[PDB]
Amino acid sequence: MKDFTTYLSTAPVIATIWFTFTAGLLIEINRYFPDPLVFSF
Amino acid sequence: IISRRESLRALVALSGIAAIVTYGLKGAKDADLPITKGPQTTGENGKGGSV
Amino acid sequence: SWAPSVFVPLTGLVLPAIAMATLFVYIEKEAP
Amino acid sequence: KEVGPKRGSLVKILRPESYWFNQVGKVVSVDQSGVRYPVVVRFENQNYAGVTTNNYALDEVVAA
Amino acid sequence: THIKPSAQVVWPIVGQEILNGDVGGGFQGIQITSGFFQLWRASGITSELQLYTTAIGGLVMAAAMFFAGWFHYHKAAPKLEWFQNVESMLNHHLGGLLGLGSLAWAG
Amino acid sequence: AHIVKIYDTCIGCTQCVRACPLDVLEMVPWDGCKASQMASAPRTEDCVGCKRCETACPTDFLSVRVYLGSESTRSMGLSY
Amino acid sequence: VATYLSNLPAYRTGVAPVLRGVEIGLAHGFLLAGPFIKLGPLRNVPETAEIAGSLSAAGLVLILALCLSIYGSAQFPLFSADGWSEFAAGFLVGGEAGVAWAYVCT
Amino acid sequence: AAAAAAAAAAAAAAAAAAAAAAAAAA
Amino acid sequence: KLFPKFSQGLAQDPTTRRIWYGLAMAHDFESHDGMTEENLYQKIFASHFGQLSIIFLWTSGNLFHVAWQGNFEQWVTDPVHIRPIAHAIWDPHFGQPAVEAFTRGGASGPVNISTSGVYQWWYTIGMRTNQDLYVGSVFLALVSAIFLFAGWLHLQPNFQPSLSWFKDAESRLNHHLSGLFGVSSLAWTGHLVHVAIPESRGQHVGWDNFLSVLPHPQGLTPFFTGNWAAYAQSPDTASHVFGTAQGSGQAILTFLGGFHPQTQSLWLTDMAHHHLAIAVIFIVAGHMYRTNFGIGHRMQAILEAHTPPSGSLGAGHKGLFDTVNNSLHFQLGLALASVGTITSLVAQHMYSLPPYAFQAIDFTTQAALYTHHQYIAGFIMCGAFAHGAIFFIRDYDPEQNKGNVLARMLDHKEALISHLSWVSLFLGFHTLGLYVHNDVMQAFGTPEKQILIEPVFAQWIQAAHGKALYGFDFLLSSKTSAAFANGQSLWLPGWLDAINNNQNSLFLTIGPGDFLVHHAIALGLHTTTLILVKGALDARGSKLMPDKKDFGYSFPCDGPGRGGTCDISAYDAFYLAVFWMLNTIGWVTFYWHWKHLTLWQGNVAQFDESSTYLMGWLRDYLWLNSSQLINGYNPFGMNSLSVWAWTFLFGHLIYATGFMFLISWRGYWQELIETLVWAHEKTPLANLVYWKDKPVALSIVQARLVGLAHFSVGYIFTYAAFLIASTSGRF
Amino acid sequence: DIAGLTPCSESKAYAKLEKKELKTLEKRLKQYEADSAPAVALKATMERTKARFANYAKAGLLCGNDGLPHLIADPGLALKYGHAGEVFIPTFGFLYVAGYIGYVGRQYLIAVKGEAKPTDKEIIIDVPLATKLAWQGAGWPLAAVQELQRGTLLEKEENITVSP
């Protein structure tokens, strides 16, 4: 499955994994921090 | 009357003369051109709403 | 007073038709 | 003697109208005759026609 | 007559839960327009159990179709003169697909 | 009459002549290359300027070169 | 039809161009008056419906007669500098006659 | 037609000078 | 065969593009057959008489149709409620409801309401009667015939100028600064002080009694003695009535600032001291350059000697003079750059400082006069870069320009274009991204989550000019500052009363809707220059095509080779910018009009709520204000807006016809014409007819121009229909 | 009150618009039973809404004529009046992450050119290499300004030109 991990390491597959990472990170933050218009403390 | 080119060029141009110089006065039909009528009822109001 | 019913069919029907014609016959002259 | 650089040296192109101006490639062969443009250079950078090689003269071509 | 058809519900995160309108029927969601609820009353579904069992029947059928393209390309793929039997294809597609399909749906 | 002028960066691979759809180009002897040949355009009266020659030249900053000049009835590609 | 095209005056070579333009003039004479006399700006005036529409249609014949002579000075036994000038002359005289022939046919 | 004929009689002398300009330039 | 008398290479063209290119490169004098440089300058010089004789015939046409078909003598007495008249209508295609719906303004027949606003300009320069307007029309019609005859005579071989007469940049720039700018403005203050000042005070100064009326009651005695403040003793009061003597005043050169109280225009007296002051400076600046008398400055020693040390600017400006004096496209490109910016400066300074009486009360006049001189400024500014790009091909000489500042422009030319491409990309990301952020927050019902950045850097400037709405108390809002206290008798109290009035366009109050749109204007300015400066710099070549200078400025392409070179020329790099120009001037005029609609209606909060997000641009400015426009004609009836309703659909039609020449390109069409040629050559009885010029499809460069023209005409006619009818529909 | 403004805890059109939104939510809430999840969702929307207004007034956001939180993007008017969290804190909270993505993407391209064929490893991202540069690029301004001092950041006039 080394050839299968090359496919997982191509350009659009890493793009669609990292964008689910980065959106999915910002979605969970914007759940547990509702509406951050301004940097509070 | 006309049979050559330059005779026909004169007759078309003179027939364009004879229609248009009459069309301004005698040829403006009562039903065709409402601009060649009299001043009717109203219209001379402001542009509406505000200024 | 009779001007705007005469000069407008000149410039708009007649004088352009002369310019439709003379500026067309000039186009396809065979150059000597 | 053998004019031009060696068979496989790195080189820098100085032809200002070439696509690889100020750019580094490998000489592949230098033709030893009275040809105007003997020095054949291969590149990794392909041009807008996909052609990775060109002939250059002796003077448009500088080492390293 | 009064309850608007709705089958898409969004997640309440950035204020996008306002897209869950008051579609009626004790329910909030995007009012759909693709008319599946009119298929399903025409199919006489009447329960969300029937929709769930034919959704599992859809996942099963999709993996069967992915198997079939895998099988009929990688494992056992047809020859050229199989495809060039256009008499046999039209006899099967007019009779079996279109004919027996509308016999089965009438049933 | 388009202006086709070729240059000394020609290598004589005659791909421009084979690509010319109007026989504008032909191959003349010339000692400045290994193939001993350089193109020539004796028939630019017939050229349309469709530039299939300089799509085909391998040399960087194309050796053949077409300058779109004044168009006659043969340069506009007319059956009429 | 090879029979019918040898009848109508565009292809009658054995006719003088004056009579050629005269028959073409009247044929387009009492015909293009039709749309002006029926559905121009004066449909609903039952006295000017035949007057101004025919007078406008005679103006259109005057435009087409100039439009023919413009072609003869542009382009150059009709295809000549003289045979066309006799052709456009017969179209003007034949066309004005046919438009008056349209108003007669009331 | 006072200022019409006076401008026309001025345009007569203006055209006569134009006949001087149409010759003395070439 | 005969029509392109200038290009014999077009005279040998048997096709129908002979007609199209006989028209379009007829004024490209540098490429005509047998043209020499002495023959070049003489045809340009006579053509400038041709432009001048058209302008004065045009202006004498405006003076005639106002004097004959207009109501200027009726508009003088009541300049608020009586609407102006441009020229009466004779369209015999009209119907009777379309006669009586266009009779307005108290006139007899149908009329057009003049939105150009030449009444307000004429009423404040002293015109009162129609007999004063016919005299001005007959005067300019004489002067237009002078410039027609002058352009004829300055081509005649006795009167043809020498080649060195044109290159005398010393003597022209010495005469045009001092005479054409100074003496002209000195003479215009002569028209103001003698005529236009006392005409507002109710005193007829005509040609009969101008040698009898003293302009000032102790005239020419302060000028010869020295007490020039005697000319500003009793000015027009704060209760002056324009056109009468009621509270008149007697000063001729007052320096007040701010506005007249009735007209809300500039004072006539400081407009007299204005054009007097710059007349003195232009005459003094008109004695700078060394022509023939041993004194003055040589242009050949000011450019070349300003070279900074340590190689800051290469070889300095060394050698530019022979590339400005000999090149015309450099001179034309500078002139279109200068005029195109002082065309905006006309537009930016006439809504805020309206110079003519009862302007900024006539609202459609204000809308037309701003939008006109912004698109006129937009086209002139992109032509500066166009003829700047023609300079690098036709006129640039690198051997003449070794190392000057002009060649260092071409040297670091990628640093210019990539830093423009960063600024344009940063602005477009972060202006659109803020509007989309605001639009989503409007869509989710929560306007509080918007990004509303207050325009601090401009409100700081307005407070520094004297706007105490924001309370920065900085310079002129600061009452204990220096600049406030150095001018309380000089020029400030008129100016400070005029800003803090909330109902004029002098330094409008701004909020975050104005933050976003100035950055959008900045986007549109930086991107339009990105396209144009790239069109100038890469006019001589790129890595894709290193001999672009060999083809010329306006060529179609360089073939499909090298990946494909659609739109590679600097002409094709100029034309893309006209789209981004009309976009940009579309953004400045949407923002001008809609902030002024909400100002003039009174709902000044209806802008600031809705301008922060792009739906409010759509559903509150385009949707809401086009209500009475599109109702210009309906099956119920029609009104005075139907000529602007018809044009509004006429503008959409030319616009979309422009996409036909832009999306469809040439070669679909050339094959379609080849079927039409067949169907013409085989049709019986139409074979009598045959063409002379062979029908070919419009060329590639032509299709750009014809499509851009249909794009631009339909763009202009659409917005001008919306601008005039949305303003005058409710006003 | 900096530039004609007012605190949102002090303005009234802000509180009027808060009461405008909670009015719209409650007249939407009335159609459902108090146990129903279409009403549990709307009351959870309100408590996200009412806390949002409480938190904007807590931070001292500036309202104006329209009662909306206005931002002040100038240091010296945000540092002086306590508003660096509006723009001046996220203008460096961004530019940390921005140049981070730039530096990681830079170091991945620099460390791929010394290979056999580097175009293959722009399709097939070397994940053990790319994640290694991803973690260790967390001190990228500390590494960039050291590279800025050498002359190794800016490549010289080996760069490609047309006709200078």
Ligand code: CLA
């Ligand atoms: C009566 C028998 C029969 C039936 C029912 C079908 C049915 C179908 N054929 Mg078909 N075919 C047949 C005989 C048959 N074929 C024969 C004899 C040949 C050789 C000449 C072909 C050659 C052929 C080609 C070359 C193609 C098809 C395609 C299709 C599909 C059309 C797509 C569509 O409209 O969706 C209708 C969808 C459905 C009705 C869903 C139900 C699907 C059923 C379960 C599968 C079809 C029944 C199957 C043929 C019976 C064998 C079962 C299998 C386990 C062995 C459809 C599934 C096209 C296609 O989609 O390729 C996959 C296509 O490209 N057929």
Ligand code: CLA
């Ligand atoms: C003092 C003597 C003098 C004067 C008055 C002029 C005057 C003129 N020359 Mg000239 N010339 C002179 C000496 C002089 N020349 C000499 C000695 C030479 C040889 C070295 C030349 C060589 C020369 C050439 C080669 C050309 C001219 C041209 C012109 C004309 C300029 C075009 C124009 O009208 O724009 C004038 C522009 C303005 C008035 C606007 C700018 C003013 C301000 C800054 C703009 C904003 C304020 C604005 C006025 C407000 C408007 C309000 C209201 C009017 C709407 C103008 C008639 C050109 C021309 O048209 O040919 C006849 C031309 O091609 N000249």
Ligand code: CLA
């Ligand atoms: C001071 C003003 C000025 C002057 C003297 C020139 C002079 C020149 N320009 Mg330039 N230009 C200018 C301003 C100026 N330009 C501006 C403001 C722009 C930007 C819009 C340009 C953009 C420009 C380009 C891109 C090019 C030139 C070119 C030329 C040269 C050829 C002239 C030509 O093609 O005319 C002929 C002009 C026409 C036939 C007009 C074409 C049609 C236009 C768009 C008008 C259409 C209006 C439409 C019909 C409106 C009616 C609508 C209807 C419904 C009412 C000549 C040296 C060309 C050149 O030098 O080639 C190397 C060239 O390529 N110019």
Ligand code: CLA
């Ligand atoms: C509405 C139409 C439109 C838009 C958006 C643009 C946008 C742009 N043009 Mg322009 N252009 C247009 C019409 C338009 N143009 C037309 C009609 C012409 C005439 C042909 C031109 C001619 C033209 C030229 C000649 C030039 C430009 C340039 C630019 C760029 C300016 C820099 C900028 O603002 O970047 C900001 C860009 C955006 C905000 C758009 C991006 C949208 C988002 C942010 C992307 C991500 C969203 C999402 C995730 C993507 C979804 C896809 C997928 C996942 C489903 C930008 C891409 C210049 C350029 O390249 O400058 C760098 C340049 O030289 N354009």
Ligand SMILES: CC1=C(/C=C/C(C)=C/C=C/C(C)=C/C=C/C=C(C)/C=C/C=C(C)/C=C/C2=C(C)CCCC2(C)C)C(C)(C)CCC1
């Ligand atoms: C391409 C090219 C070209 C063109 C160019 C252009 C087009 C330009 C433009 C330019 C421009 C368009 C510029 C502008 C400028 C401006 C400026 C530079 C400004 C400044 C300002 C100022 C300085 C101000 C000041 C002030 C203030 C602050 C306010 C108040 C007042 C005062 C004065 C104090 C040419 C042709 C040459 C050729 C070559 C190349």
Ligand code: SF4
């Ligand atoms: S130009 Fe067109 S025709 Fe002439 S050679 Fe090149 S390709 Fe063949």
